[PDB]
């Protein structure tokens, strides 16, 4: 529970080195803003993370 | 009248041996069935996301990218 | 599925279209029917009817529609204007000097008050 | 009659066309939705549309009724199935085509495609 | 033989066989360094400003001097009120002119400053160099950086030392280093720096492989296949898409709220807006050279200019007869071009309601456009029977080059930044590279699938090209292959695949990174 990521396989449905990551610069992937990440619900729709600006019809 | 969402079906008449004719299938309906029918489902609103398609020339294996299982490399 | 519908779909497929919408071929067939009926009626009114009557009817119809297509050198496409008239108009227009602009107005000036949407609320 | 009084009374002359359809087609035609455009104007436009459709419907019914009681349908108005049920009046392609021909529309089709 | 015909034709025709810019640039450079250096760097701001102001006053451009004084007064209003009021001849000006300013600095800082000034000699650094030489003198020292809590200041305060010649000569370090709390050879140093710097240039390329690049992808969901065009702003802060429903939608690429200059919309919370007013499908959009203006064209035959500050239309241009398919701003954003169904190319300026130039010569509809980096030439391409590319002159309005060879519908055109190369793609998957001056094809690139290549982009130095196709791929090409040390062409550096997302736009940033965009369709 330190960060939020969308790398889990459930997000989209539609040697074992014992060193910290900063020892291998050639394996690091930059981070995306959580509000802009591609996460899907069970049905298969893309969840909108901007609940502040949503309005009801 | 060509923007309807209903399926297109053709009948088949036989004027004779080897001379078929086709007509559009159209059955009379009552106004109750049309007026009382439910509306289709409303799709969700437009939105956009982001992800990394490639880092330093290599494609990460994340859910947002295609699987390696399924023309991208010269072999001459 | 009727005949010539498969043929039109095959023709479309053989030209790059990778997908269609069911109803296009019906639209094309009905358009062909209506065009044939109109031309036939015109030819019948003109004059048993010969080929000259049909040619005259088509020529008359070409005066107010079908001014398009993929015509090339001296083909009546894109409105049907002649290249000499367009060249004359271009010569007339391209004779004036380009507008004078200063660095302090480059990107902020607009047309006169008569050609702007001011006060449309 | 005056435009001001009519617009003020527009409360009592709302048509049956839902506001969603009005907003959708106004946006398609190039006019922003009611929040930026007085709702009275949108209601007026929808009422004009309703009046136009009702006029066409009355013309079609008049055409259908005079035909009711040689005796072969006019070519170019293909459509239908068994022919309906009972002695009910059926809105068919022929009457609609005859009615809208007076408004400048052509709805000619083919009966059999072969 | 065409050569015989051309020779006969030619023979029959008788053919015989100022200071404010520099100050702002220096300030912007200064605030970019580490906070350690800034304390010593800020000492250069006041002398430069005062000497520039006095020079402008003396030269007779009193208007420019007044403008400089009023513009920068807010910056120094909290330190030198009395001096600024005096500047509103007295002995103060004479004393300033007679005695040249003395500013202490470190050797490494001096070297960095000289290198930076040389790097931008023609951009405005020459003015600062001249001012510093003439009206100023730098007493370089080997001490460490001077700061209220650095080693040098702490040592001097604790050990009760004495000031130096540099420290002797209205902010003075004496108030800091006292208990109450060398010269320079510029000009010579400049040629000297240039000689040292010229030794570290790269002048060859042998062996090796192509450059690696990264990519970021933006995907649009729930579009239902109604999106027709796409465009990013020049700084990659906004994205606009036109639809088949006649409206346009702009988003914030980071999700932050958009702002409106209207007072009634003070601090409203929305990150996407709509531009309505077209009555037909929108086919082109273009952000102006932050961007405040936007252009769009539709099938109804109109071009509309929108405002990104109040989010409303301003003017309509009505020169076309039929659909308009493409619209493009000029390389600097006052001129724009358009072309559509009626087989003509028109050039506009935003100040006039009628096209200033009309370009005739194509035999079919136009399907692509492009500007030259210098802003005085335009490129266009036609389809069908006449598949050719043409280069027009904006001064005269005549054609000067024709390129032939394409056998398929042409979808994209692009001109290199250096101004000497041109790229084009068609629906057969081919990419052509043309020499503009000689009008000759250089080479062909292959590897893309059939369908179309909507966009192209050139690297900053014009040595790498990136393309996006409707086959859901992004590919990188090498314009010139490395010299040998002794279905797909061998110059394709990389190729990436998307997850069922046709690519409608690719863009090269300042770095070796690109941004792409497309629409996701599950089917």
Automatic annotation (TrEMBL), chain A:
Annotated compartments: Nucleus
The protein's name: SAGA complex subunit Spt7
Entire-sequence positions represented here: 639 to 718 of 1196
From TrEMBL, chain B:
Protein name: TBP-associated factor 6
Similarity comment: Belongs to the TAF6 family.
Subcellular location(s) per record: Nucleus
UniProt organism field: Chaetomium thermophilum (strain DSM 1495 / CBS 144.50 / IMI 039719) (Thermochaetoides thermophila)
TrEMBL record, chain D:
GO molecular function, one term: promoter-specific chromatin binding
Range of residues in the leader sequence: none
Keyword rRNA-binding: no
Primary localization: nucleus
One example of a Gene Ontology biological process annotation: transcription initiation at RNA polymerase II promoter
One annotated Gene Ontology cellular component of this protein: SAGA complex
Keyword line: Nucleus, Transcription, Transcription regulation
Compositional bias of kind Gly residues: 70-84
Compartment list: Nucleus
Family from the record: Belongs to the TAF10 family.
Role noted for this protein: Functions as a component of both the DNA-binding general transcription initiation factor complex TFIID and the transcription coactivator SAGA complex. Binding of TFIID to a promoter (with or without TATA element) is the initial step in pre-initiation complex (PIC) formation.
This protein's name: Transcription initiation factor TFIID subunit 10
The organism's taxonomic lineage, starting at the top: Eukaryota, Fungi, Dikarya, Ascomycota, Pezizomycotina
Full protein segment contained here: 54 to 204 of 204
UniProtKB/TrEMBL annotation, chain E:
RNA-binding among keywords: no
Biological processes annotated in GO: transcription initiation at RNA polymerase II promoter
Sequence intervals crossing the membrane: none
GO MF annotations, alphabetized: RNA polymerase II general transcription initiation factor activity; translation initiation factor activity
CDD domains, sorted: TAF5_NTD2 (cd08044), WD40 (cd00200)
WD repeat segments: 220-254, 317-358, 359-402, 403-444, 453-480
Record keywords: Initiation factor, Nucleus, Protein biosynthesis, Repeat, Transcription, Transcription regulation, WD repeat
Localization in the cell: Nucleus
Pfam families per UniProt: LisH (PF08513), TFIID_NTD2 (PF04494), WD40 (PF00400)
GO cellular component: transcription factor TFIID complex
Family that this chain belongs to: Belongs to the WD repeat TAF5 family.
Name of the featured protein: Transcription initiation factor TFIID subunit-like protein
